[PDB]
Design a protein around this ligand. Structure first.
Ligand SMILES: [Fe+2]
Ligand SMILES: [Fe+2]
Ligand SMILES: [Fe+2]
Ligand SMILES: [Fe+2]
Ligand SMILES: [Fe+2]
Ligand SMILES: [Fe+2]
Ligand SMILES: [Fe+2]
Ligand SMILES: [Fe+2]
Ligand SMILES: [Fe+2]
Ligand SMILES: [Fe+2]
Ligand SMILES: [Fe+2]
Ligand SMILES: [Fe+2]
Lengths: 271, 271, 271, 271, 271, 271
């Protein structure tokens, strides 16, 4: 298993830039061509929500074209910036396993050594996350019927506060219900989240829980300041690889930077 | 608890650049000034090994001046590029708890809600890591006395293969020794490493294990290509913060980038 | 009093770039988000003319949306690139004090310790400036009835030649009539101008007279060369602050640059 | 008269960088070459203080070589970072009119239509400025003999508070002494300063008073924040040109930017 | 004779970027303004094919506007990305000598000391080049009836393999027929080509044969790898100047770079 | 045969920059590492003169270390900035075939299908080139013994005027001597030169004659302007490859740029 995992693409409609000046559509089309150009090709690409910025049909048209140009199977989940009905109408053809009920988009993948569970934590009318009664139950069904095979969950909202003053009030409001599932099920060992536009990681019991950077704009972690900052610090994604018994995640920079060169002992320490 | 955690500084002697073209001394001095300019000021700065590039006295003179200019208590450990004896002669005044014995540099910090354990995985005459039995028994004694109080370990070399074709052969060669300790002690919940010049994370039982990006040059993760690449992709550090009973790690970019701006709902979705 | 003062925005219509390659709309939307992100917030933003590039309705639509997203009261005046009727139709809702006569857009503001006078020096069918009979008179009425309270004028065109070979032939043609007002009225102590896309300043009697940089593209000052140059040297704006008896103007860079860091005596002069 | 006016060079010793990361010596050498490459060649170059950063002999050796490579007559004055004795030993051969006495460095230039007065506001043992009575009486005598011929003064420290929270406490402490002279002498019409690393301008009676940007690092203007910030925002200098009876100052960017191109009406507004 | 020679503009339609992220329309409009800003003005501009990316009418509309804003006579030829009929419909007004038969676009220019021959090597339905029976014959007529006057050919496709693994299979398939003409006609001494997006040159008999960089994106030369790479390495064009008996071609960079400065002996080698 | 061909390195002494601001030593060390990192590895590296900037021993110490770190056989020739005696003392161990006599440095290489002839056009006491009669008769003997086997010559100075107003007066002063040899020997088909810091190519009979870009700073081609300009436009080198019976030269960018990506027909022309 090799997965490329990007998040928080925030597509805008065809003539438009995010906030009027951040060319998210171009930045995302660059990211897509970077992923298709990889020498070590992923089995699938994951996009953990906030696919469009305004939940508008014209943004979904752009998202469909650009994400549809990925030469990889896609696993797509919504964030609070998404519209459920439009997300399903436009993007389900790119991720058929979502289903055809816009209120219950979920899928389990077990092509790999680790089971993958994709859920919708987005809630209409709020920036906060919510795990529906039926999502919590289906999650518990996957883990209860899943025996000893490890599981990883992909969801938009972090299921616990991370001390981030901007982002904590809008984490998954009943995320403690998912933490109850990690306490009860030793097989649940990874939870990967968007939302935060930041690489921030913690462990709860046997589960490593991490948010991802966005593909374009980032949000800095502030502990005290609640001012709603964003910046254009370097974008990146996470590669997830199965290495024997170990699920390893490594950061793959999506910036354009000098290099690489080759290490040489004589050049490193001249005499 | 707030910690700033950098590694793999690779200081050169005064007037030299890494490989003749990477100005590591300037770049690290920029980093030191970034860390002194932080609004949310850390309680301490950790530097997780490969402080100098060639283990030369004149490189340690530069490291001592530049790291000595941090306005914080420092916790310093060696990497394979370090020389144990010179590291102690030059850097022990910056980190008095290392001690008087270059072959047994390690210390425990009990100031915070999680205990911090700093160890030396570097071995003279090789790039590979090695955990001596005296390090392992010191760790056993620390973890046993510690009881239910959580513990994090800082070491240069990752204690398990991460699937990185360049870095795996030179990981901690007897890392099983540390893995056996995480199995023994449910208290041991973080291991943070340098060496890989890359943010790559994994979980072994209750322990999150992560390598850090370098402060200057990075090394890309390749699974099958063995070429010793390095590049100048974006540098960062990890901030470690105790948030309730959660240890949270977030990436803090060391690059100079545009922003921040403030999010505004009218600018986000114009009508 | 704190005023942010930008000039020469040169908005283009929605799909378009200035000269086909300079993204003025994005550059201006960045500038707008920079102004809304200021820690020390201005009481008002001034835009001293050339708001659009071609005097076209579709450019005014863009200008209205982007300038309308400023979270500040606005004082807007036209330049030679503007159309009076369209400027009034589209932008008067953002600056109601202009009036409803497109040929006589003028306003006095005296919320502050210094009176502010905003005038239209633009003339239909020419790049040169002209002060209408009625503008000169209204200006003299403000100063004559204004007693000892200092006054500052904002106008698009400089009221005197500055030795700039490109820009002098197209300064305010009867600007000497305004200089007659500074000779006669000691209270008139500031005249700020756009047009030149350059910070150039001089004093005439008690009046400091200055042109501003543009928000996007600049024009270099040449004394001999009349070739119509523009470049993309760094953009900036002027902040105007009342500091006791003193009106002080400082340049605020609108570029994205490294920093800031904090000055430290030990780092400045190492021993 | 054409003058190029730079300041706050902050030269370091050979092989050192400011704060360990700002290559001031390279950046100033770039500036010197930019000034030698000017198409409209100045009659002289003014450098308004803080020539070196630490007042060290080896910094003056660098300053002497780099400033000595300007293909122009120089007028040099000290700032607080300078050492008076060493400044005279090293730099007087570049500016012979300073004299033989390190405590009374000043000179008048009568080559041009406006007389130029260069003075020393630096005081040993402090960052604050000080105008000695011998400086004030020399100025009185210069301004009295000068009669109706306009005069500009060059000094390191601004003679009044500008509202800059970082810079105000270290302005010219007894600047009232100079303000009293502008009240006395209607002839005194410009005062140009370094120290603030910022273009900030004001008017006191008939005098325009301006501080200049630095050639390398800048300091942002904060009204309420006291933190000693510096950044690497765009560097520039001021060109001073006599234009008829107008002294005009224009900003000349020292950055490397795209352009220039030529304005073309068809490209400006396509049909 | 001075000719500016650009190639492989790859215009997209008005809202669009190449591959979604490369702004070819803006990059080309910058290139056009660079050419109109030249101090040493060419007699004509040559564009050696791939004018548009998709052979679509809306791309030709953009090409017509941007290339039409060049203040120079134009010689335009198609590449494999062009549509013959649309190329003629939209661009023949900019290069009337093409004719009015879209299948036989060719022209000879002999205003200069060297005859210029412009041909269409593009073939409907393939990326490969083909010289039509009638093109080969007309070429031979020009050279046979042209006596001792030197000739240069401009064509899109290289008439011989260059060892480039990506580009060789799609060179001019019967290019050996043109090589037969260089063997037979000593007056044919230059063949300049697009297609390769790379400066690559060789000689065959008395003929120098060269491909050009693109104005925007480039393709790297690989000898073994057939992966279809493109990158954004620096763009440039070729200037062609007649210097006595010599046709000289020099590379003119279209990037924005620091400089120029003036060489000075004392600065070059300090003492 | 694959050759990497760089020139005009202009190495400075340790800790110095060219003109005080161009870090030639770092930039060339970057280049050396780029050449060691090549996927298609050259058989040898040619450096065509102006190895050092001032002909100083300490510059040759830097050149020896940095060029000595190339993992390839080197062919080195001097330029006018070189000192013949010091060039031989320091660089002959890197290029043993130069010999023992500083006044007659030259060699022939017969390893490849085309013979390579390396000569010294530098003349003590001038910038101009000079071909000694002993060089010419050595060349005659080489070309006569060589018979039908093609030959390329590497020399620092171009053997004919290229119309470059800065560079023509300091070309090879007696270059007619070499032109006479191309007339004599149809076998002599390439002459490659440094000196001009520019890719400029021409053809004389069966010979392609080209100057190369520098590895760091470039010089623009001006036909009428005599000012000694240099800039920091993009650096490159030439790769020389034998492809069947064709010698092909391609430009290899030494800049750090975005890419590569892979071409995809759906992304190229979306529907
Ligand atoms: Fe988001
Ligand atoms: Fe979100
Ligand atoms: Fe390292
Ligand atoms: Fe290491
Ligand atoms: Fe304007
Ligand atoms: Fe204007
Ligand atoms: Fe200063
Ligand atoms: Fe100062
Ligand atoms: Fe092409
Ligand atoms: Fe093509
Ligand atoms: Fe050279
Ligand atoms: Fe040379």
């Amino acid at each position: 298993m090799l997965l490329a995992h990007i998040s928080d693409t925030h597509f805008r409609s065809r003539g438009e830039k995010l906030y009027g000046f951040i060319d998210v559509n171009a930045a995302n089309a660059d990211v897509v061509s970077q992923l298709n150009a990889l020498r070590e090709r992923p089995d699938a690409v994951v996009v953990s929500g906030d696919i469009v910025n305004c939940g508008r049909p014209e943004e979904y048209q752009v998202a469909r074209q650009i994400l549809g140009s990925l030469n990889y199977p896609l696993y797509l989940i919504p964030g609070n910036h998404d519209d459920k009905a439009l997300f399903l109408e436009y993007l389900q053809p790119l991720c058929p396993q979502l289903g055809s009920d816009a209120n219950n988009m979920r899928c389990a993948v077990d092509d790999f050594a680790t089971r993958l569970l994709f859920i919708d934590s987005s809630r209409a009318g709020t920036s906060k996350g919510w795990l529906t009664d039926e999502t919590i139950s289906w999650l518990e069904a996957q883990l209860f019927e899943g025996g000893d095979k490890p599981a990883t969950i992909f969801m938009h909202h972090p299921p616990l506060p991370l001390g981030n003053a901007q982002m904590d009030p809008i984490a998954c409001e009943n995320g403690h219900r998912l933490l109850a599932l990690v306490e009860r099920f030793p097989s649940l060992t990874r939870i990967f989240c968007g939302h935060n536009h930041s690489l921030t990681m913690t462990q709860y019991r046997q589960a490593l829980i991490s948010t991802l950077p966005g593909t374009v704009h980032q949000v800095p972690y502030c502990h005290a300041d609640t001012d709603p900052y964003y910046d254009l610090s370097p974008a990146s994604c996470l590669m997830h690889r199965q290495v024997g018994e170990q699920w390893v995640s490594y950061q793959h920079s999506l910036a354009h930077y000098a290099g690489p060169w080759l290490y040489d002992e004589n050049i490193s320490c001249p005499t």
